[PDB]
Amino acid sequence: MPSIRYPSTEFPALTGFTVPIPETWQPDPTMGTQFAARPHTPPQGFTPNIIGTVRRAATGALHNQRTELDQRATQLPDYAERGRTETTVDGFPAYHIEYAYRHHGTITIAQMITLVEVSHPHAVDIIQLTATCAGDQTADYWDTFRLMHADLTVQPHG
Amino acid sequence: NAMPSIRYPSTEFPALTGFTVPIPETWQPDPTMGTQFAARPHTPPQGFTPNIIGTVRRAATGALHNQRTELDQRATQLPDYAERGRTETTVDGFPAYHIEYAYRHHGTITIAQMITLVEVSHPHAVDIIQLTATCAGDQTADYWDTFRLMHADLTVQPHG
Ligand SMILES: [Mg+2]
Ligand SMILES: [Mg+2]
């Protein structure tokens, strides 16, 4: 049996990425994601957070994930979208979406997502950055979230 | 107004563990599948194409146990679920889990799957390496031993 090792030239390592965080926040290495941060002084109730995850996916993944986000939208109660954009993050194709919905009739969840697609020869990486807070926390956090997403960078050569 | 940056990978958010799978000379890697590892036969049976895929992901402490629970729940649901066996195990010394099962897909084909999970611990989190081989029910006589050999010879390449 030939031995197929990951990473290799034809199954490359995952793209790196960087997120700036403000003084009021701190990284959370226990979250279980490749990037996470939380306020050092969290409010009562919902704990706002931001996470980042990079994964290998097939060519066309950014379009497929956008469809999945569309489809998920139809199944979030009281879905309210602020906006969606097609953009670039370091020149790499990206998608950004901001919305809120009502979860179990019990809390309002507001989320800000950026997806970035880095292309390899045979496949892609999708970087997903997701910031979440409660609906009555958006006045406290939305500008901070926007800055973190705006200054997301990707490092495809390490 | 000057925000520091948090870079992945780093000591606190480390890179993913590598892994290696041997494949028969009658199989070939498939870099287009969209996974960190994939392979398929050069000449497959008709209908379903047998394949093996490998993924490694970052997860929280306790993820292997959690995934075992999530697989158990996914099961009580899958039509005509049939389990060959399950067990805790180790792979290159690391905690691991193995399960083999089949179920009915679309009422038209039986899908047989062999899964090995390996949990590599980092200081604050873990990696889960998941190896999944799949063929159709009428293909197990031709493929199950080949699957066993690939799962038996999975190795892990941690980095300090
Ligand atoms: Mg478009
Ligand atoms: Mg660049």
UniProtKB/TrEMBL annotation, chain A:
Mg(2+) binds at residue 86. GO terms for molecular function: metal ion binding. The keyword Signal applies. SUPFAM superfamilies: Mog1p/PsbP-like. It comes from the Bacteria. InterPro entries: Lipoprotein_LpqN/LpqT-like (IPR019674), Mog1/PsbP_a/b/a-sand (IPR016123). Keywords: Metal-binding, Signal. It holds the Pfam family Lpp-LpqN. This is DUF1795 domain-containing protein. It comes from Jonesia denitrificans (strain ATCC 14870 / DSM 20603 / BCRC 15368 / CIP 55.134 / JCM 11481 / NBRC 15587 / NCTC 10816 / Prevot 55134) (Listeria denitrificans).
